[PDB]
Amino acid sequence: GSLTEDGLSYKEKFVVRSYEVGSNKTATVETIANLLQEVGCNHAQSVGFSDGFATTTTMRKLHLIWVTARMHIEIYKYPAWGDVVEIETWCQSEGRIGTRRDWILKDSVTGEVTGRATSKWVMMNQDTRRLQKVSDDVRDEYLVFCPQEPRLAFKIPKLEDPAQYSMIGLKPRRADLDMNQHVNNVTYIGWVLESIPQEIVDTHELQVITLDYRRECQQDDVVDSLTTTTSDSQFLHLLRLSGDGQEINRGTTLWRKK
Amino acid sequence: GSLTEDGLSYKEKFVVRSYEVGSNKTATVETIANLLQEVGCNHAQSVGFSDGFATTTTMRKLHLIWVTARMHIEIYKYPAWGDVVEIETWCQSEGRIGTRRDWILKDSVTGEVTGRATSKWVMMNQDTRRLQKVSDDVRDEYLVFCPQEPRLAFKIPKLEDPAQYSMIGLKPRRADLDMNQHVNNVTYIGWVLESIPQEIVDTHELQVITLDYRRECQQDDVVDSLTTTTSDSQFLHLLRLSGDGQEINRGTTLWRKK
Numbered sequence A, B: 001g002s003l004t005e006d007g008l009s010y011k012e013k014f015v016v017r018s019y020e021v022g023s024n025k026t027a028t029v030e031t032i033a034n035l036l037q038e039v040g041c042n043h044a045q046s047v048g049f050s051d052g053f054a055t056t057t058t059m060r061k062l063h064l065i066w067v068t069a070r071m072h073i074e075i076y077k078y079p080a081w082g083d084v085v086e087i088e089t090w091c092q093s094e095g096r097i098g099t100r101r102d103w104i105l106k107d108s109v110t111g112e113v114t115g116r117a118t119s120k121w122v123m124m125n126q127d128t129r130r131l132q133k134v135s136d137d138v139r140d141e142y143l144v145f146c147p148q149e150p151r152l153a154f155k156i157p158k159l160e161d162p163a164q165y166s167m168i169g170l171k172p173r174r175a176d177l178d179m180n181q182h183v184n185n186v187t188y189i190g191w192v193l194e195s196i197p198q199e200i201v202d203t204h205e206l207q208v209i210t211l212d213y214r215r216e217c218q219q220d221d222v223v224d225s226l227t228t229t230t231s232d233s234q235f236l237h238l239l240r241l242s243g244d245g246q247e248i249n250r251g252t253t254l255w256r257k258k
């Protein structure tokens, strides 16, 4: 992949691999989320930000990292094994709040848009996990890599007891940790989907997922995935620590019949 | 990737992705095993065998599939994020016993061999799971895609109670299933490694893994990963069904200090 001509977005092509697809012989939404992260990491390296943490100079001095606050993905068509998908990504300033990253997915052959995503990322001190606002010094470091006029690819309630569906006692394995020994964010998408009934997964495709991230999760921890139907099929989701512990994630999904 | 000039082996290049690497910023052995499977699947498609099951014409008529009996991987150097690895693969007849698939991994830049693998695959009826010998009709269908003179890339005891180390209650999630809703074989490598102490993983790299596959495993099942030190560091491994149930896998690993 590469930066585009104007230097303000990044494109990469991926050939869908055999082990990346599910029963319908199309890429899983976890594969799609991994590809979104990969093209984002390559974009960060292409402008001089990357060691596992994409950071600006002032972020590194202040022990700040970007953490996901919200992820929103819409997929029109999942690509097949051997298909070529092209993903374009870019970022925009959200003032003091944080930083937006957007993506557009295309079928490389037809040029049709097959998916879109947007995310909100916020500053966090990597040691204390306390959220911070974006200073002028940090914003000024990355603004020169962003379109400055709008370019858009486009509350979640708390699940009430009792949950309709659950998958409890979910534990990460080493494959779920990133190069910084943090639980990979895509893991959270997988954990949400684990509590969706097999009958729904067999008969429907995921069209939209929205996840809020409240509090990151850890290697030694145990997570419960809770789901209730709110309806297409529509669900409300809550990830919380084992033992009726703290909320990690809440989300919604929208599913279309096959 | 593509078949080579003579049509008897297949090469593919992979650019190591951010999410494919572990703490040492090099590809995990699970990433390497996924890449071995991918280049093998692309080789099978390139000669007309592939629907999730690579099968010959007579295999499809008889409801036979190839299943892994043994996997043996040696890694000299794990590639970094952004590195290009080229994998060459080929197969050879093992007479009536089964079919061998071999791989060689190179660093595309230096041309140095960075790893090697060999595997034994056997015929199994997909419905009954009973092992079968390779008939002349099946062997004759695939022999024309194999070197016929030797081309080589190059017993495990049963772990005794009590195990030195364990990870119990391991359950697959949907991401661990392949396009045929079988547990992906690479999952078995991940499950073996889960019972290796974190201190060993932090201070050592995996140099050799050998796995025997006894009995495939299922979606609804629970697996215990058992490990004892036999020594570099050397381990003996046993995967068995929960409740002191049937053996799934046995294996060995050899680890080098970082």
Ligand SMILES: Cc1ccccc1CO[C@@H]1C[C@@]2(C(C)C)CC[C@]1(C)O2
Binding pocket: A036, A037, A040, A041, A043, A044, A047, A049, A054, A066, A067, A091, A099, A100, A101, A121, A142, A145, A146
């Ligand atoms: C802000 C920015 C502009 C242009 C190129 C790269 C960046 C850095 O983006 C960060 C890198 C990251 C990506 C790895 C998903 C994680 C947070 C972030 C917004 O997306």
Ligand SMILES: Cc1ccccc1CO[C@@H]1C[C@@]2(C(C)C)CC[C@]1(C)O2
Binding pocket: B036, B037, B040, B041, B043, B044, B047, B049, B054, B066, B067, B091, B099, B100, B101, B121, B142, B145, B146
């Ligand atoms: C036997 C053969 C010769 C040339 C090209 C392909 C094949 C089929 O190989 C099979 C495909 C497979 C691969 C997907 C790992 C699984 C079993 C097998 C030996 O490796």
